[PDB]
Each structure stands twice: as structure tokens, then as C-alpha cells.
Amino acid sequence: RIISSEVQESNRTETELVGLKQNLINNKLKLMNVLETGIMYKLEILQEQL
Amino acid sequence: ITLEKDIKNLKHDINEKTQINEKLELELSEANSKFELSKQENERLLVAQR
């Protein structure tokens, strides 16, 4: 009972938190995609044109 | 929490660089307009001289 409701339940919450961590990392990678290859690339081309 | 703060900080960076890019695009359009106006005005003045 302690495992299923306290230990393994805490481990399930930990797995959900790790999944949230991976989702946040993926969102961060998307932001670097929009930023580096994007808004910095857009900044570079805009500065070149200007 | 650290990754969420990183995402938020990178979103303010996105917003700042997006304001910069909006200013750059406004300045690019303004430079194009200033070219067309100024070169046409110089053409008009040189044509009056001619």
C-alpha cells in the first residue's frame, strides 16, 4: 500500500514532472528555432537590406 | 521552474528582438520610400537645371 499510494505514486508524479521537463525542453528548442534560425535570421536579412 | 523561467526570458528576448525587427522593417520601408522620393526629387531638380 505504501508503494502503490506513496512511493510508486510519487514516482508516477516524478515521471509526469520529467515529461513536463522534456516538453519544456522541446518548447525551448522551438524557441531557439524561431530565434536563431528565425528572428536572428530575420534580423540578419533585415539588417542586410537596411 | 528553471526551464519555465528560461522560456519566459527567451520570450522577452523574442519580444525585444521582434521589436528590433519591426523597427528594422519599418526603417527598411522608410529607406525605400526615402530613396524613391529623394531620387525623384533630385531627378526633378537636375531636370529643371537641364
The conformation of residue B38, written as its DSSP 8-state character, comes to H
Contact between A35 and B13 under an 8 Å Cβ cutoff? The reply is yes
Measured between alpha carbons, how far is residue A27 from residues A21, A23, B22, B29 in Å? 10, 6, 24, 33
| A25 lies within 8 A of chain B by CB | yes
Decide if B7 and A47 are in contact by the 8 Å CB cutoff.
no
| Overall resolution, Å | 3.2
Of the candidates B14, B26, B9, which has an alpha carbon nearest to the alpha carbon of residue A36? B14
**Gap from A36 CA to chain B (nearest CA, Å):** 10
B9, B10, B19: which to substitute to probe chain A, counting the most A Cβ within 10 Å? B10
Angle at which helices A41-49 and B2-49 cross, to 10°: 10
Indicate yes or no: CB of B10 within 8 angstroms of CB of A47. Answer: no
CA dihedral of A32, A36, A42, A43, whole degrees rounded to 10: 120
* Dist. CA B16–CA A13, nearest whole Å: 36
* Four-point Cα dihedral B29, B31, B34, B36, nearest 10: -70
Distance, CA of B16 to CA of A48 (rounded, Å): 19
